[PDB]
A and B are shown apart, each in its own frame.
Chain A
Amino acid sequence: LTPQLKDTLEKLVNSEKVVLFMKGTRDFPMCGFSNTVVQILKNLNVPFEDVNILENEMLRQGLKEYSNWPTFPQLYIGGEFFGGCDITLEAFKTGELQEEVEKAMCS
């Protein structure tokens, strides 16, 4: 990432209380790990912004470094990287994802 891309990424992750950078769209995920996170956000009825990194290589590579998480999906909550698919699944199983979404929506 360049400093302009970093500034854009900072604005982008803060634009909605929950942002999901993923393979595909929320109606059409293109990979099972991406679908697992979309279904979790629907189970918890979380409004969120879905962003398709398969059609933006510079975004994909910048986000990999910004989150320090090289694979997708990448879930950001409250303007901060929360986690990837495995972190999100374990958070759904413990209630911790709902706690973070609640924190963001109430902030």
Chain B
Amino acid sequence: VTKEQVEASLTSKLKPIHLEVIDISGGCGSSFEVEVVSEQFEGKRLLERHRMVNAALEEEMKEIHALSIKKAQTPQQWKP
């Protein structure tokens, strides 16, 4: 797992308007914090949105030691 792989797998799936991925593992590629903004999140309660992000990074999840999805926002939540 690298930051670029986290970013690409989330991008191809979630079509984000903004994505942030932060490696918090010291560049080890083992733990991340993630913020996503997408119109795909509209119409979905947060549990369903969390499932979309988890399905997007399904391969990475098998290896990483932490994940902190912080935001899974509509553009309207991102910019009130």
Contacts and interface: CB of A to CB of B under 8 A. Distances in A.
Contacts of B70: 86-87, 90
Interface residues of B, number: 17
A96 interface: yes
Interface in A70-93: 70-71, 77, 80-87, 90-91
Interface in B53-76: 54, 61, 64-72
Interface residues of A, number: 21
Nearest to B55: A68
Contacts, number: 48
A85 B67 CA distance: 11
A70 B65 contact: yes
A84 B34 CA distance: 13
B50 interface: yes
A105 to B, nearest CB: 15
Interface in B4-36: 33
A80 B68 contact: no
9 contacts: A70-B65, A70-B66, A77-B47, A81-B50, A83-B46, A83-B69, A84-B68, A90-B46, A100-B45
